[PDB]
Short mmCIF file of all heavy atoms in Angstrom, two decimals:
data_model
loop_
_atom_site.label_atom_id
_atom_site.label_comp_id
_atom_site.label_asym_id
_atom_site.label_seq_id
_atom_site.Cartn_x
_atom_site.Cartn_y
_atom_site.Cartn_z
N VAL A 1 -17.01 17.03 -92.91
CA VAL A 1 -17.25 15.68 -93.40
C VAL A 1 -18.56 15.09 -92.87
O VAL A 1 -19.20 14.30 -93.58
CB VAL A 1 -16.07 14.74 -93.06
CG1 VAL A 1 -16.28 13.37 -93.65
CG2 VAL A 1 -14.77 15.34 -93.56
N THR A 2 -18.99 15.47 -91.67
CA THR A 2 -20.26 15.01 -91.13
C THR A 2 -21.47 15.63 -91.83
O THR A 2 -22.54 15.01 -91.85
CB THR A 2 -20.34 15.31 -89.63
OG1 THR A 2 -19.09 14.98 -89.01
CG2 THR A 2 -21.45 14.51 -88.98
N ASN A 3 -21.32 16.81 -92.41
CA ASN A 3 -22.44 17.58 -92.96
C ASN A 3 -22.57 17.40 -94.46
O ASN A 3 -22.94 18.34 -95.18
CB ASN A 3 -22.29 19.05 -92.61
CG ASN A 3 -22.60 19.33 -91.16
OD1 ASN A 3 -23.61 18.88 -90.63
ND2 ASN A 3 -21.73 20.09 -90.50
N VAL A 4 -22.28 16.21 -94.98
CA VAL A 4 -22.46 15.89 -96.39
C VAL A 4 -23.84 15.26 -96.55
O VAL A 4 -24.10 14.21 -95.96
CB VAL A 4 -21.37 14.95 -96.91
CG1 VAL A 4 -21.71 14.46 -98.30
CG2 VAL A 4 -20.03 15.66 -96.91
N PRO A 5 -24.74 15.86 -97.33
CA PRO A 5 -26.09 15.31 -97.46
C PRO A 5 -26.10 13.99 -98.21
O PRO A 5 -25.17 13.65 -98.95
CB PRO A 5 -26.83 16.39 -98.26
CG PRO A 5 -25.77 17.09 -99.02
CD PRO A 5 -24.56 17.08 -98.13
N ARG A 6 -27.17 13.23 -98.00
CA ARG A 6 -27.31 11.93 -98.65
C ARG A 6 -27.47 12.05 -100.16
O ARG A 6 -26.97 11.19 -100.89
CB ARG A 6 -28.49 11.16 -98.05
CG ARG A 6 -29.78 11.95 -97.98
CD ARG A 6 -30.81 11.23 -97.12
NE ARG A 6 -32.09 11.93 -97.05
CZ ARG A 6 -32.93 12.07 -98.07
NH1 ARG A 6 -32.67 11.55 -99.26
NH2 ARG A 6 -34.06 12.74 -97.89
N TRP A 7 -28.16 13.08 -100.64
CA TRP A 7 -28.28 13.28 -102.08
C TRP A 7 -26.98 13.72 -102.73
O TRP A 7 -26.90 13.76 -103.96
CB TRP A 7 -29.39 14.30 -102.39
CG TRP A 7 -29.20 15.65 -101.77
CD1 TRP A 7 -28.36 16.64 -102.19
CD2 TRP A 7 -29.88 16.17 -100.62
NE1 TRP A 7 -28.48 17.74 -101.37
CE2 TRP A 7 -29.41 17.47 -100.40
CE3 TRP A 7 -30.85 15.65 -99.76
CZ2 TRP A 7 -29.86 18.27 -99.36
CZ3 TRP A 7 -31.31 16.45 -98.72
CH2 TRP A 7 -30.81 17.74 -98.53
N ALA A 8 -25.96 14.05 -101.93
CA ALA A 8 -24.62 14.29 -102.46
C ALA A 8 -23.88 12.99 -102.72
O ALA A 8 -23.20 12.86 -103.75
CB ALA A 8 -23.82 15.16 -101.50
N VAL A 9 -23.98 12.02 -101.81
CA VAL A 9 -23.32 10.73 -101.99
C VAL A 9 -24.16 9.75 -102.80
O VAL A 9 -23.67 8.66 -103.12
CB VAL A 9 -22.98 10.08 -100.64
CG1 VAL A 9 -22.19 11.04 -99.78
CG2 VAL A 9 -24.24 9.62 -99.93
N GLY A 10 -25.40 10.10 -103.12
CA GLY A 10 -26.22 9.29 -103.99
C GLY A 10 -25.60 9.05 -105.35
O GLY A 10 -25.48 7.90 -105.80
N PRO A 11 -25.20 10.12 -106.05
CA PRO A 11 -24.51 9.93 -107.33
C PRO A 11 -23.19 9.19 -107.23
O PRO A 11 -22.76 8.58 -108.22
CB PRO A 11 -24.29 11.37 -107.82
CG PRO A 11 -25.38 12.14 -107.18
CD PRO A 11 -25.57 11.53 -105.83
N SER A 12 -22.53 9.21 -106.07
CA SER A 12 -21.26 8.52 -105.91
C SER A 12 -21.41 7.01 -105.79
O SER A 12 -20.45 6.28 -106.06
CB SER A 12 -20.51 9.06 -104.69
OG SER A 12 -20.11 10.40 -104.89
N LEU A 13 -22.58 6.52 -105.38
CA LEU A 13 -22.81 5.09 -105.32
C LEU A 13 -23.10 4.47 -106.68
O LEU A 13 -23.02 3.25 -106.82
CB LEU A 13 -23.96 4.77 -104.36
CG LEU A 13 -23.67 4.88 -102.86
CD1 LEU A 13 -24.95 4.76 -102.06
CD2 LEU A 13 -22.68 3.82 -102.45
N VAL A 14 -23.44 5.29 -107.68
CA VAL A 14 -23.74 4.77 -109.01
C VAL A 14 -22.48 4.62 -109.85
O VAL A 14 -22.34 3.64 -110.59
CB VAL A 14 -24.77 5.69 -109.70
CG1 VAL A 14 -25.15 5.13 -111.06
CG2 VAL A 14 -26.00 5.85 -108.83
N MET A 15 -21.55 5.57 -109.74
CA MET A 15 -20.31 5.45 -110.50
C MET A 15 -19.46 4.28 -110.04
O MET A 15 -18.72 3.71 -110.85
CB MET A 15 -19.50 6.75 -110.42
CG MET A 15 -20.18 7.95 -111.04
SD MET A 15 -20.35 7.90 -112.84
CE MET A 15 -18.91 6.96 -113.33
N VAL A 16 -19.54 3.91 -108.76
CA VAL A 16 -18.83 2.72 -108.30
C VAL A 16 -19.33 1.48 -109.03
O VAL A 16 -18.54 0.66 -109.52
CB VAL A 16 -18.98 2.56 -106.77
CG1 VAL A 16 -18.35 1.26 -106.31
CG2 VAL A 16 -18.34 3.74 -106.06
N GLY A 17 -20.66 1.33 -109.14
CA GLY A 17 -21.21 0.24 -109.91
C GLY A 17 -20.84 0.31 -111.38
O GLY A 17 -20.57 -0.71 -112.01
N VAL A 18 -20.83 1.52 -111.95
CA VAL A 18 -20.48 1.67 -113.36
C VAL A 18 -19.05 1.20 -113.60
O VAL A 18 -18.77 0.49 -114.57
CB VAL A 18 -20.69 3.12 -113.81
CG1 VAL A 18 -20.12 3.33 -115.20
CG2 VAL A 18 -22.17 3.47 -113.80
N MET A 19 -18.12 1.59 -112.73
CA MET A 19 -16.73 1.18 -112.87
C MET A 19 -16.48 -0.28 -112.52
O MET A 19 -15.52 -0.86 -113.02
CB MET A 19 -15.81 2.08 -112.03
CG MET A 19 -15.99 3.57 -112.27
SD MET A 19 -14.88 4.59 -111.28
CE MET A 19 -14.21 3.40 -110.13
N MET A 20 -17.32 -0.88 -111.67
CA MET A 20 -17.20 -2.31 -111.42
C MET A 20 -17.90 -3.16 -112.47
O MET A 20 -17.66 -4.38 -112.52
CB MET A 20 -17.75 -2.66 -110.03
CG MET A 20 -16.68 -2.76 -108.96
SD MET A 20 -17.30 -2.61 -107.27
CE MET A 20 -18.90 -3.39 -107.43
N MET A 21 -18.74 -2.56 -113.31
CA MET A 21 -19.37 -3.28 -114.41
C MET A 21 -18.44 -3.49 -115.59
O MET A 21 -18.78 -4.24 -116.51
CB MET A 21 -20.61 -2.53 -114.88
CG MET A 21 -21.74 -3.43 -115.35
SD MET A 21 -23.34 -2.62 -115.25
CE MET A 21 -24.40 -4.05 -115.14
N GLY A 22 -17.28 -2.84 -115.61
CA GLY A 22 -16.41 -2.87 -116.77
C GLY A 22 -15.77 -4.21 -117.04
O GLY A 22 -15.11 -4.39 -118.07
N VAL A 23 -15.94 -5.16 -116.12
CA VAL A 23 -15.36 -6.49 -116.27
C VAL A 23 -16.35 -7.49 -116.85
O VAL A 23 -16.00 -8.66 -117.06
CB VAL A 23 -14.81 -7.00 -114.92
CG1 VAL A 23 -15.92 -7.64 -114.09
CG2 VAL A 23 -13.65 -7.95 -115.13
N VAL A 24 -17.58 -7.06 -117.15
CA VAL A 24 -18.60 -7.96 -117.66
C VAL A 24 -18.28 -8.50 -119.05
O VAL A 24 -18.82 -9.55 -119.43
CB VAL A 24 -19.98 -7.26 -117.67
CG1 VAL A 24 -20.11 -6.35 -118.87
CG2 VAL A 24 -21.10 -8.29 -117.64
N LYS A 25 -17.43 -7.83 -119.81
CA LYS A 25 -17.10 -8.30 -121.16
C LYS A 25 -15.91 -9.27 -121.15
O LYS A 25 -14.97 -9.15 -121.93
CB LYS A 25 -16.84 -7.11 -122.07
CG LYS A 25 -15.75 -6.16 -121.59
CD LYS A 25 -15.60 -4.98 -122.53
CE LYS A 25 -15.06 -5.42 -123.88
NZ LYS A 25 -14.88 -4.27 -124.81
N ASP A 26 -15.98 -10.25 -120.25
CA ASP A 26 -15.04 -11.36 -120.25
C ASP A 26 -15.71 -12.70 -119.96
O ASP A 26 -15.06 -13.73 -120.11
CB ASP A 26 -13.93 -11.14 -119.22
CG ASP A 26 -12.86 -10.18 -119.72
OD1 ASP A 26 -12.51 -10.26 -120.92
OD2 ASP A 26 -12.37 -9.36 -118.92
N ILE A 27 -16.99 -12.71 -119.56
CA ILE A 27 -17.70 -13.96 -119.33
C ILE A 27 -17.97 -14.63 -120.67
O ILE A 27 -18.37 -13.97 -121.64
CB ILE A 27 -19.00 -13.70 -118.56
CG1 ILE A 27 -18.70 -12.98 -117.24
CG2 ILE A 27 -19.73 -15.00 -118.29
CD1 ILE A 27 -19.94 -12.48 -116.54
N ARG A 28 -17.77 -15.94 -120.73
CA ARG A 28 -17.98 -16.68 -121.97
C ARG A 28 -19.47 -16.82 -122.25
O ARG A 28 -20.09 -17.83 -121.88
CB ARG A 28 -17.32 -18.05 -121.90
CG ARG A 28 -16.04 -18.16 -122.72
CD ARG A 28 -15.43 -19.55 -122.60
NE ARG A 28 -14.90 -19.79 -121.26
CZ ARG A 28 -15.17 -20.86 -120.53
NH1 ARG A 28 -15.98 -21.81 -120.97
NH2 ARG A 28 -14.63 -20.97 -119.32
N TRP A 29 -20.07 -15.82 -122.89
CA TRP A 29 -21.49 -15.85 -123.19
C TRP A 29 -21.84 -16.84 -124.29
O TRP A 29 -23.03 -17.13 -124.48
CB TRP A 29 -21.98 -14.45 -123.59
CG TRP A 29 -21.94 -13.45 -122.48
CD1 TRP A 29 -21.01 -12.47 -122.29
CD2 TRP A 29 -22.86 -13.33 -121.39
NE1 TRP A 29 -21.30 -11.74 -121.16
CE2 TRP A 29 -22.43 -12.25 -120.59
CE3 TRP A 29 -24.02 -14.03 -121.02
CZ2 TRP A 29 -23.11 -11.86 -119.44
CZ3 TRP A 29 -24.69 -13.63 -119.88
CH2 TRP A 29 -24.24 -12.56 -119.11
N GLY A 30 -20.86 -17.36 -125.02
CA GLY A 30 -21.15 -18.31 -126.08
C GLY A 30 -21.73 -19.61 -125.56
O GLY A 30 -22.69 -20.14 -126.13
N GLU A 31 -21.17 -20.14 -124.48
CA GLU A 31 -21.68 -21.37 -123.90
C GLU A 31 -22.99 -21.11 -123.15
O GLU A 31 -23.34 -19.97 -122.83
CB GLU A 31 -20.65 -21.98 -122.96
CG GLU A 31 -19.49 -22.65 -123.67
CD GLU A 31 -18.42 -21.66 -124.10
OE1 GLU A 31 -18.56 -20.46 -123.78
OE2 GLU A 31 -17.44 -22.08 -124.75
N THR A 32 -23.72 -22.19 -122.88
CA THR A 32 -25.01 -22.08 -122.21
C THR A 32 -24.88 -22.11 -120.69
O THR A 32 -25.52 -21.30 -120.01
CB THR A 32 -25.94 -23.20 -122.67
OG1 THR A 32 -26.01 -23.20 -124.10
CG2 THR A 32 -27.33 -23.00 -122.09
N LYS A 33 -24.08 -23.02 -120.15
CA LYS A 33 -23.92 -23.10 -118.70
C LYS A 33 -23.25 -21.85 -118.14
O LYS A 33 -23.73 -21.29 -117.15
CB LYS A 33 -23.11 -24.35 -118.34
CG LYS A 33 -22.93 -24.57 -116.85
CD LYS A 33 -22.26 -25.91 -116.58
CE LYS A 33 -20.75 -25.79 -116.56
NZ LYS A 33 -20.16 -25.95 -117.92
N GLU A 34 -22.17 -21.40 -118.78
CA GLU A 34 -21.47 -20.20 -118.33
C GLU A 34 -22.29 -18.93 -118.50
O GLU A 34 -21.97 -17.92 -117.87
CB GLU A 34 -20.15 -20.06 -119.09
CG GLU A 34 -19.43 -21.38 -119.34
CD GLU A 34 -18.56 -21.81 -118.17
OE1 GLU A 34 -18.51 -21.07 -117.16
OE2 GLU A 34 -17.93 -22.88 -118.26
N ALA A 35 -23.33 -18.96 -119.34
CA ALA A 35 -24.22 -17.82 -119.48
C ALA A 35 -25.35 -17.82 -118.45
O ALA A 35 -25.61 -16.78 -117.85
CB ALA A 35 -24.83 -17.79 -120.88
N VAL A 36 -26.00 -18.97 -118.23
CA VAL A 36 -27.05 -19.04 -117.23
C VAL A 36 -26.48 -18.81 -115.83
O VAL A 36 -27.07 -18.09 -115.02
CB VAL A 36 -27.77 -20.40 -117.32
CG1 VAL A 36 -28.82 -20.51 -116.23
CG2 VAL A 36 -28.40 -20.57 -118.69
N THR A 37 -25.32 -19.41 -115.54
CA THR A 37 -24.73 -19.25 -114.21
C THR A 37 -24.41 -17.79 -113.92
O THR A 37 -24.60 -17.32 -112.79
CB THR A 37 -23.48 -20.11 -114.09
OG1 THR A 37 -23.79 -21.46 -114.46
CG2 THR A 37 -22.96 -20.10 -112.66
N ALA A 38 -23.91 -17.06 -114.92
CA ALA A 38 -23.64 -15.65 -114.73
C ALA A 38 -24.91 -14.83 -114.65
O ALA A 38 -25.01 -13.91 -113.81
CB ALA A 38 -22.75 -15.13 -115.86
N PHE A 39 -25.90 -15.12 -115.49
CA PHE A 39 -27.11 -14.31 -115.54
C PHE A 39 -27.94 -14.43 -114.27
O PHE A 39 -28.46 -13.42 -113.79
CB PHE A 39 -27.96 -14.68 -116.75
CG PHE A 39 -29.16 -13.80 -116.94
CD1 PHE A 39 -29.03 -12.53 -117.46
CD2 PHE A 39 -30.43 -14.25 -116.59
CE1 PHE A 39 -30.13 -11.72 -117.63
CE2 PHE A 39 -31.53 -13.44 -116.77
CZ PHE A 39 -31.39 -12.18 -117.29
#
């Protein structure tokens, strides 16, 4: 476990973001305040 290179865990930090991005399709983008505040 100590001998795992950084370029091995590099790809693992991107899929976490990809799977946490899946909730973006619930913000009320129709309104202006709720869109600027999120953006």
